Design a protein around this motif. Structure first.
Motif, PDB file in Angstrom:
ATOM      1  N   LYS A  47      23.545  10.943 136.086  1.00 35.98           N
ATOM      2  CA  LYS A  47      23.843  12.311 135.684  1.00 35.98           C
ATOM      3  C   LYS A  47      23.416  13.311 136.751  1.00 35.98           C
ATOM      4  CE  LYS A  47      22.965  11.116 130.823  1.00 35.98           C
ATOM      5  NZ  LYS A  47      24.175  11.685 130.176  1.00 35.98           N
TER       6      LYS A  47
ATOM      7  N   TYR B 151      29.132  15.458 130.088  1.00 39.96           N
ATOM      8  CA  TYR B 151      28.348  14.459 130.798  1.00 39.96           C
ATOM      9  C   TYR B 151      28.537  13.096 130.137  1.00 39.96           C
ATOM     10  CZ  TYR B 151      25.754  18.015 133.451  1.00 39.96           C
ATOM     11  OH  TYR B 151      25.400  19.038 134.301  1.00 39.96           O
TER      12      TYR B 151
ATOM     13  N   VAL C  86      31.204  14.613 136.214  1.00 45.48           N
ATOM     14  CA  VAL C  86      30.829  15.820 135.485  1.00 45.48           C
ATOM     15  C   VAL C  86      31.982  16.801 135.485  1.00 45.48           C
ATOM     16  CG1 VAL C  86      28.837  17.306 135.095  1.00 45.48           C
ATOM     17  CG2 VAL C  86      28.768  15.625 136.948  1.00 45.48           C
TER      18      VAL C  86
END
Length: 71
Positions: free
Chosen positions: A57, A14, A32
């Motif tokens: 994220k 990440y 990712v």
């Protein structure tokens, strides 16, 4: 993280691929990747330019969940 954990994989990667810029570029874009034991590092799942790093994220992770839904 539950799906990756459940799949018995290590913790995925990440890191924001694009963050900050010439002032008007405070939208954050992140990609990712997960270690799918059967193949390896998955296709880097780039999320949408988000106005908050936490949303960056998570939103990319949501697309990742689709990849992990094909396992």
């Amino acid at each position: 993280n539950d799906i990756c954990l459940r799949k018995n994989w290590p913790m995925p990667s990440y890191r924001c691929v694009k963050e900050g810029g010439p002032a008007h570029a405070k939208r954050f874009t992140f990609g990712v990747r997960v270690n799918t034991s059967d193949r390896g590092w998955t296709d880097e799942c780039i999320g949408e330019p988000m106005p908050s790093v936490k949303k960056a994220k998570d939103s990319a992770a949501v697309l990742l969940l689709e990849l992990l839904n094909k396992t």
